[PDB]
Design a protein around this ligand. Structure first.
Ligand SMILES: NC(=O)c1ccc[n+]([C@@H]2O[C@H](COP(=O)([O-])OP(=O)([O-])OC[C@H]3O[C@@H](n4cnc5c(N)[nH+]cnc54)[C@H](O)[C@@H]3O)[C@@H](O)[C@H]2O)c1
Ligand SMILES: NC(=O)c1ccc[n+]([C@@H]2O[C@H](COP(=O)([O-])OP(=O)([O-])OC[C@H]3O[C@@H](n4cnc5c(N)[nH+]cnc54)[C@H](O)[C@@H]3O)[C@@H](O)[C@H]2O)c1
Ligand SMILES: OCc1c(F)c(F)c(F)c(F)c1F
Ligand SMILES: OCc1c(F)c(F)c(F)c(F)c1F
Ligand SMILES: [Zn+2]
Ligand SMILES: [Zn+2]
Ligand SMILES: [Zn+2]
Ligand SMILES: [Zn+2]
Lengths: 374, 374
């Protein structure tokens, strides 16, 4: 009934940094060639969405944020072959064009069509599908999931199992897949190893899940909010430490606890100082540290390269290193087969209309993931 | 006969930074339990030795430096089982104790018994075997090869082929093995890949050799001294670039040349700025950059962690990642079997008495390796 027509719907528009989202009517254009218009069903609140609010992440405003979601295809533009109306889908904030040198590489996932490195806030064609109060509104990461309807490029959507519970599998669109893949694919955590995970939010919990799945013998959670420790232990942490409890810097504490440094460490917060701490705490000759947290815009860290010269490996990744369109349907299939759990990440459920309360819950430290339902 | 006796011999003593070596008589104590006294045959001049002179590397003075060498066992202490008098040997500036967590790790080589991190300038027992003009003289990296005779711990010496030409295979004690291993073992250069090598001295040329042995399709040498380019091309560089020739930063030049970034880059100079450039010039999603150079003591670099978040891997290594005592004899056997060449690294051969002249050749840009002969 809406194919080829502008849809008026509600969205959460961010007009200004450091302000509440405005739930109000937007106009969503129909999909152009190789575009897909999706009726959203569920979207998670990831800390990266909050970064847009805080200005930690710089992207053009005004914007419709949201990148962790699942929905149902309402219509497809000309030439779309990989989804159809009625299919369940997850938007892909890291696209998979399948054609660029990264998509062709066996270990690349950061497709060159991404809108993360130097955000334009548009569709692939450099234009917007969103109007609000007669003004064009930016997209975010090609996804813009804080809307009852969004339009995405075909390279930014994956078809998933028709029997998927969308209020759970939305987390495969960011936080679960990122954390789990950062452990199993990026770090390649080994059986019997010792891991340290800095930050015990939805992504860090997912890192612990992966480290446990990989067979780590010790998984040390690190957070300044000790209310995060119980859930971290439930999903596999063997012990948790709060840096505020110690006179000494936590890299020295973790090096002592691990009899000379950990095998694998993960920065899952977004602070320059914890990125250097996390590198330092892995064993100097053969340790690996993975940056997962999003750093504040345009700020440089300072570090002594002797940390690397001794043998450490330092790497980072977007979306757990997963090639997004290949991996998301497989991850949903594995979830359907109970290969991993998503419920431990979901602490709150709210209607979309209570998005601001959802952000309040994240900022207070109370929530892991709030799932918004449309 | 010298066994069990103090030897009076010639050595190059560094009494203070930024002064010439003093070629004079030292006394060399006999080896204690688990120690080996070696008559030196040949030693190379590595830039790391010059870093001790310049203050780039801090190590206790006065000192007998030198770490790239080969010689013949004069005598062994009680309990030595791995060499005998008359054996050809290479001292190991990275030891292999065989017992520490690093030595037991499949990918570790930076043995915890090393004297690099926190140099004491002693034998493993915290004492010195050297005196000069009645004063105790420090060891350097457990090796101290700028002497007619040295004493090393057993864990810091490898027995090599009795038919080895010691005036060539001394380079397996540092520069060849470091560069070659940085490419083949630490980076794991792939067939058909594009490499960039920053610094075309003895170590950087050995990195080129390894990149070519690994089947790289393109190997771009980078040096501010264009006199270094002809030999770089002889051993496998396909292109050479001088940053001073460009209005743009060389990371931009190399990204353009490689149609979006190199597969593998190597910092083989010792400058903070080139370490960040080398990381930047590798492809942002799947590139690997290896730090080989040694920069000025206690200086931090500045970098934007977004370089890592996109997917880059940044690592460093000592001695090409090789477990020293297992690897050095195999590298010498492979040299004897013509699997690689060492002559391209050797530009000058001088008597040991001309050590200062050999350092002046390095500092002036003329030489790659000077081999000093005893
Ligand atoms: N690389 C990616 O693809 C990717 C994906 C998803 C999220 N992110 C980022 O990952 C980070 C974590 O996201 P999330 O789990 O949704 O966030 P979150 O739920 O806010 O969790 C962060 C955790 O860090 C804790 N923390 C804060 N400061 C410190 C400190 N100084 N020391 C130790 N713990 C501290 C904090 O208490 C909280 O539990 C954010 O920076 C995201 O932007 C990156
Ligand atoms: N990691 C290890 O185990 C290890 C082993 C051996 C050597 N090293 C270090 O590796 C480095 C190279 O040693 P080497 O090959 O004996 O030294 P070298 O022979 O002096 O070569 C260094 C090269 O760098 C070139 N260079 C200098 N500045 C620049 C610049 N700004 N841009 C590009 N090129 C430049 C210079 O012209 C020269 O050709 C030194 O810092 C050594 O201390 C490390
Ligand atoms: O949470 C996933 C996520 C990221 F990892 C980013 F690096 C980023 F810029 C962003 F906008 C994002 F949403
Ligand atoms: O050239 C090898 C070498 C190094 F790689 C160092 F890191 C160091 F401190 C040193 F003294 C040395 F000789
Ligand atoms: Zn692509
Ligand atoms: Zn996210
Ligand atoms: Zn050891
Ligand atoms: Zn050296």
């Amino acid at each position: 009934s809406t194919a080829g027509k502008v849809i008026k719907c509600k969205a959460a528009v961010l007009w200004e940094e450091k302000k509440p989202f405005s739930i109000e009517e937007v106009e969503v254009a129909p999909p152009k060639a190789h575009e897909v218009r999706i009726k959203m069903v569920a979207t998670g609140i990831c800390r990266s969405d909050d970064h847009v609010v805080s200005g930690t992440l710089v992207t053009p405003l005004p914007v419709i944020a949201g990148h962790e979601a699942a929905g149902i295809v309402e219509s497809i533009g000309e030439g779309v072959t990989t989804v159809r109306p009625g299919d369940k889908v997850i938007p892909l904030f890291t696209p998979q064009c399948g054609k660029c040198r990264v998509c062709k590489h066996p270990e690349g996932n950061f497709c060159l069509k991404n809108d993360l490195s130097m955000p334009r806030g548009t569709m692939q064609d450099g234009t917007s599908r969103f109007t609000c109060r007669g003004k064009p509104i930016h997209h975010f990461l090609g996804t813009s999931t804080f809307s009852q309807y969004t339009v995405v490029d075909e390279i930014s959507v994956a078809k998933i199992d028709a029997a998927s519970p969308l209020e759970k599998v939305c987390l495969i669109g960011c936080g679960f897949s990122t954390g789990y893949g950062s452990a199993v694919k990026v770090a390649k955590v080994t059986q019997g190893s010792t891991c340290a995970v800095f930050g015990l939010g939805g992504v860090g919990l997912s890192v612990i899940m992966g480290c446990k799945a990989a067979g780590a013998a010790r998984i040390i959670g690190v957070d300044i909010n000790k209310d995060k420790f119980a859930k971290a232990k439930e999903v596999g942490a063997t012990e948790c430490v709060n840096p505020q409890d110690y006179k000494k810097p936590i890299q020295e504490v973790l090096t002592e606890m691990s009899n000379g440094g950990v095998d694998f460490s993960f920065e899952v917060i977004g602070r320059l100082d914890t990125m250097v701490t996390a590198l330092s705490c892995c064993q100097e000759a053969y340790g690996v540290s993975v940056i997962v947290g999003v750093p504040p815009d345009s700020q440089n860290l300072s570090m002594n390269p002797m940390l690397l010269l001794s043998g450490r490996t330092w790497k980072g990744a977007i979306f757990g290193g997963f090639k997004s369109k290949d991996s998301v349907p497989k991850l949903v299939a594995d979830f359907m087969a109970k290969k991993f759990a998503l419920d431990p990440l979901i602490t709150h459920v709210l209607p979309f209309e209570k998005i601001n309360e959802g952000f309040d819950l994240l900022r207070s430290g109370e929530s892991i993931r709030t799932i918004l339902t449309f």
